[PDB]
RNA sequence: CGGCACGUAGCGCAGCCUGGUAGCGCACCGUCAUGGGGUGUCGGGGGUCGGAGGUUCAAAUCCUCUCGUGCCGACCA
RNA sequence: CUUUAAUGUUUGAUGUUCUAACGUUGACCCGUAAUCCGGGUUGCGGACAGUGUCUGGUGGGUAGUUUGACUGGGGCGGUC
RNA sequence: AAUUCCUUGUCGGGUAAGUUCCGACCUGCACGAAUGGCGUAAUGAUGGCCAGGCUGUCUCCACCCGAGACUCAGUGAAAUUGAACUCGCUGUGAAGAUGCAGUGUACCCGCGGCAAGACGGAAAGACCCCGUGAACCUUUACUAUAGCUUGACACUGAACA
RNA sequence: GCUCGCCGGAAGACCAAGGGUUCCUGUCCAACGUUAAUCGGGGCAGGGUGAGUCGACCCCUAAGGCGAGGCCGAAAGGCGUAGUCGAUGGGAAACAGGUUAAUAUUCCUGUACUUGGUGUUACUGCGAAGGGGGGACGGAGAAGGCUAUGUUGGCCGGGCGACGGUUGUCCCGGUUUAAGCGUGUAGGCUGGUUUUCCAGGCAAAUCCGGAAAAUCAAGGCUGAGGCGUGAUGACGAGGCACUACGGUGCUGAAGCAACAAAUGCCCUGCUUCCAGGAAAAGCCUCUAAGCAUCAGGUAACAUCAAAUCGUACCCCAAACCGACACAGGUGGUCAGGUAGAGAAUACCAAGGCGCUUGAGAGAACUCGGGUGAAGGAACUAGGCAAAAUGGUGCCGUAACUUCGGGAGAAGGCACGCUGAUAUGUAGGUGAGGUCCCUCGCGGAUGGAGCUGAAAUCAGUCGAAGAUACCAGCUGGCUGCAACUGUUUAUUAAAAACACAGCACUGUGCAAACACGAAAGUGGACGUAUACGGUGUGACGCCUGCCCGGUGCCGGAAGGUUAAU
RNA sequence: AGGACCGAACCGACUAAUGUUGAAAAAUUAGCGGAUGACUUGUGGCUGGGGGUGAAAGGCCAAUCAAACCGGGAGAUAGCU
């Protein structure tokens, strides 16, 4: 449920929170936590190497089973949890052999539903399966790229992939990016869209909202002197340069993909 | 070191 | 106002102490020069 | 004011550079339509070349004297 | 001891297939109670990718420099 | 107009009087639509203008209470300084004279006050030019170069077409 | 020594950090002290730091560091695995009083406790560098319960007043007491117990986890405080002695109750919200290899061990950072009375100070304050500075507005003291007595005693009752920037930066991109609702034309073109 | 509930006067802003010199910054004083 806020102060006036009532209020499943500890955007050389990163709230790491090996055994989703480490929500699971795990949380989620992995397994939201064994056209979320590797495609809130074809030992997928990429078919791929979806609609509303998600301010090119950055000086705004990144390569259209090792796999690039 | 008036620009610059 | 020297022995030793000095080829050359110079306090330690 | 560019038929540019002819657009004017106009088919006319002449067979040109006009600068303190 | 053409070759261009160099920031095994490395099995990729030498392009991202003199101050103009 | 040179443009308003201000006009020297256009409640130690209150801000300054300034005792600095027996004026003069000429004036020495002069002190003038000076910054200046990118040969093989 | 004055959320008190003998006592005054100096944080000499329990060492780990092998690198070296280090966090245990000139939770008196070794006596499956549990965690808010703590009365001791009065409804003072042990309350959390079975917890497990039943529901953790004990103890107003006049001994009353009451505790609770809130060990439990009379394990009592190092003094400062005995900077802890919302503010207590030149003068001028006839911004670049406003309740309040605001708009009225309502009320607290009972720190009823606002009526003093301190000036038009925020440490706080929102663009993950000869690392234990880059900058209405230039994207033709 | 309101501690540094051989190599006094947050603070850690860091001023990197400090090349060179 997306909800506007009443302007009892500027910087609430514009806020729009997503309230999920059916999300577990209270502490998460203790033994699937490990410390995360913040990066400050910094290298093992101490050198800021990705800018604009710092502070933010503390965040304990939920494990999350991306691979989905427990084939055969079924599980029941105890509850839905909030995860600070991602856009999506996670569902605490409980397989029948008494074991608990963390799955993502496809659009259906809802406590009490029944999940299962493996070549058998019902075609139904939440069940993982080699795409060898998922019917072309399904809407399959968190997808493996190398069979057995992990699951790396479409894990963000509301995302999904569309299987469109499957000649040979390969499948062609339709990634949200609109790309068309071939993938080994033997790859796992959990069924359905991933949740929240509404995530898109929050509005944050003030400076702090950004800071306390660990995002630091972005300082424009042309707000700095020549030595700092290819942009501006000027005695008054001024530009007169093709736009570039602070290291001189152009933004505004220059592709910068160079791979070859993996070009075999891309059928059609996005637009 | 230096006296403050010598360092200060308004008194020092005086005739340009 | 708060001035530049804010003393703290832990930091002192960790940054300038004998062992710290000893932990690097150049840190060692530091001592070597001071020994050759015949300095009475190689590195201001306990 | 000074720098430097140009006024060219009613009006605005070419031709100048690399001396000559002076063109072209639409307008003016006449024919011809149409009842008449406008338009237009269609015929002719229109420039001391901004003023001026030294070079020279030949000067709008190049050069020199010169007029306003436009444009660039009268800034560092 | 041939051009109008084709069987055996030594040799380029393109296209398919293979595995055996090479990659694997898939999986499993051992060193080993170890997310490093190595060995091993295997799947994937495969003479590509990547790298060395050479080479055309791009290259203020970075560096070293040049950017005249006269002049009734200097600049602009002009001059040489 | 944070843009208007001409410019205090012109008209309206406010004032006894308004180069600012508010409202207009459009002749925009030289606004204009994400190097965003036009608006905008709220917010602002933000800029401009107005009014009530308020007053020593002013007419124009008076008195008072405290801390210095002054006197005694104790302690005891500083910058500057070629050397000094270190006046006014008019003139001369490296061109703005305590020091030269002429002349006027002035018994010797403190203390408290004041800053017109010693081109007062302080800093080998920023500013101006100069040096075949420096540095950082810019770019379609010059020559190179990391990076990116291209092909050839090597690592590098087998087939069949 | 007697006055006087100043701080009292400090200018009192305890530390950490830092200093490193500045502590205490004698002695000296040359130099140090902005003066003198008999005095000192100064010279000289002597003294002084006592711990099983405080702290370090120690066990445990965060960030991060180091890193056998290892990967990488012309050399130097780089990164990193196993590990090993690293507190700013976790980990067993002592309190009240006394004493030294100088330390004391360390010494002494009283009264305790922690963990191991050994022994005795009972009773028993013990056992990991391993599993599980626990330790273990955010922000805001809301009260209830309670202590510190205060006030009054009672109680105790003392007083009868330098000046009219004070035998009383009068004055002054004190009225303090711990850990530990017992009790397990207000109140928080949670259904217990048995049997069987199981793809999980790398092996194992009786533990944890999951599935069934079966049976009673009251069981179990957690837990401030109170109460009892500790305690015939201690402390104690005040007394009497002597003192080398600094002090030092001795003795010693009452030691209850009521009301109020924290920001402390219960509370690591409870409620709620999004930004979703360390780790590891100690501890508990589980078993594997292994040991089975043994060894070990559990309990009672007895006994032994607990080393080493720190402990003086300053610590918002004359002892630390500031070259100074420098108006500056310096983290944590404690926190009384009267008024007050208050840790504001004013006056005080405990306690601590008067700032290391003074003495006189009563000029100009300068600094800091007070008052001012009439005028009231005429000042000036500009109301710069001053002046004014200033509290609480009620009444009342415009354009405009994103419907919250604008708003404390603006502007009114009341305000002290006395009596009455009511010898003290509404309210708060709450003992007796009576009944109930799983008898308790229970509950019900009960209303003494205590505490006690605000209102109104009547009256009354001053020029004045929000009387000091403290404590908004208000309104109109307009530029800019939405807003809170950030910035040139030391002439610029703004219209600059940032911002949420917007758009373009890159990036398919061994991502783009960045640090890096490389290994590797960040991006991210993220995956296109993601991430980088660039411009714009809440919101409202919107964002027109031009691809010739320069750039970027696409383009399997052809022309020109490198090594070879 | 709030980058909500008034206001101490705490954090800031808009105005003025004083001070300018200061009490002070950047403070004092009176006013001023924020004051549950993009807050503020103790301890400890990491980032290194054409490099760091930078809500961006060429700011800060030990009273030093359009390229820190220390030593070295070194008696750089100086058609200038
Ligand atoms: N305190 C000086 C100001 C100042 C200090 N350092 C300076 C250096 C340069 C100029 C001025 C200063 C004053 O009297 O105003
Ligand atoms: Mg941004
Ligand atoms: Mg800008
Ligand atoms: Mg700038
Ligand atoms: Mg400028
Ligand atoms: Mg600038
Ligand atoms: Mg411009
Ligand atoms: Mg260059
Ligand atoms: Mg050179
Ligand atoms: Mg010249
Ligand atoms: Mg204007
Ligand atoms: Mg631009
Ligand atoms: Mg602001
Ligand atoms: Mg004297
Ligand atoms: Mg004279
Ligand atoms: Mg005199
Ligand atoms: Mg004077
Ligand atoms: Mg000079
Ligand atoms: Mg000493
Ligand atoms: Mg002493
Ligand atoms: Mg003396
Ligand atoms: Mg001494
Ligand atoms: Mg450790
Ligand atoms: Mg080694
Ligand atoms: Mg390492
Ligand atoms: Mg510690
Ligand atoms: Mg003591
Ligand atoms: Mg025994
Ligand atoms: Mg564990
Ligand atoms: Mg009590
Ligand atoms: Mg009497
Ligand atoms: Mg009493
Ligand atoms: Mg002590
Ligand atoms: Mg002193
Ligand atoms: Mg001091
Ligand atoms: Mg106070
Ligand atoms: Mg003094
Ligand atoms: Mg005096
Ligand atoms: Mg008056
Ligand atoms: Mg006026
Ligand atoms: Mg005037
Ligand atoms: Mg005036
Ligand atoms: Mg003012
Ligand atoms: Mg005042
Ligand atoms: Mg702003
Ligand atoms: Mg400044
Ligand atoms: Mg400022
Ligand atoms: Mg984007
Ligand atoms: Mg802007
Ligand atoms: Mg606020
Ligand atoms: Mg406030
Ligand atoms: Mg500095
Ligand atoms: Mg020299
Ligand atoms: Mg040399």
Residue numbers in the entry:
A (entry chain C): 1 to 271
B (entry chain 7): 9 to 24
C (entry chain 2): 1 to 46
Pull verbatim passages from the article behind this deposition:
The construct was expressed in E. coli, RNCs were purified using the N-terminal His-tag, and an RNC structure with an average resolution of 3.2 Å was obtained by cryo-EM. In addition to the density corresponding to the TnaC AP, a well-defined globular density (∼4.5- to 9-Å resolution) was visible protruding from the exit tunnel. In the fitted model, the C-terminal end of I27 extends into the exit tunnel and a β-hairpin loop on ribosomal protein uL24 is lodged in a cavity in I27. The I27 domain further packs against ribosomal protein uL29 and ribosomal 23S RNA, as if it is being pulled tight against the ribosome by the nascent chain. The A-strand is the first part of I27 to emerge from the ribosome, while M67 is located in a part of I27 that is shown by cryo-EM to be located in very close proximity to a β hairpin loop of ribosomal protein uL24 in I27-TnaC[L = 35] RNCs. The interaction with the I27 domain shifts the tip of this uL24 hairpin by about 6 Å compared with its location in other RNC structures. Specifically, residues from V49 to N53 at the tip of uL24 loop are in contact with I27 as shown in SI Appendix, Fig. S6. We conclude that the peak at L = 35–38 residues in the force profile indeed represents the cotranslational folding of the I27 domain at the tunnel exit.
In this work, we use such AP-based cotranslational force-measurement experiments, simulations, and structural studies to investigate how the ribosome affects the folding of titin I27, a small all-β Ig domain with a complex Greek-key fold; the stability, kinetics, and folding pathway of I27 have been extensively characterized in previous studies of the isolated domain. Using a combination of MD simulation, force-profile measurements, and cryo-EM, we have investigated the cotranslational folding pathway of the 89-residue titin I27 domain. Here, our equilibrium AP assay and structural studies reveal that an all-β protein, titin I27, is able to fold within the mouth of the ribosome exit tunnel, despite its folding being dominated by long-range interactions. Molecular simulations, accounting for the effect of the entropic restoring force on protein stability, reproduce the yield of protein from experiments remarkably well.
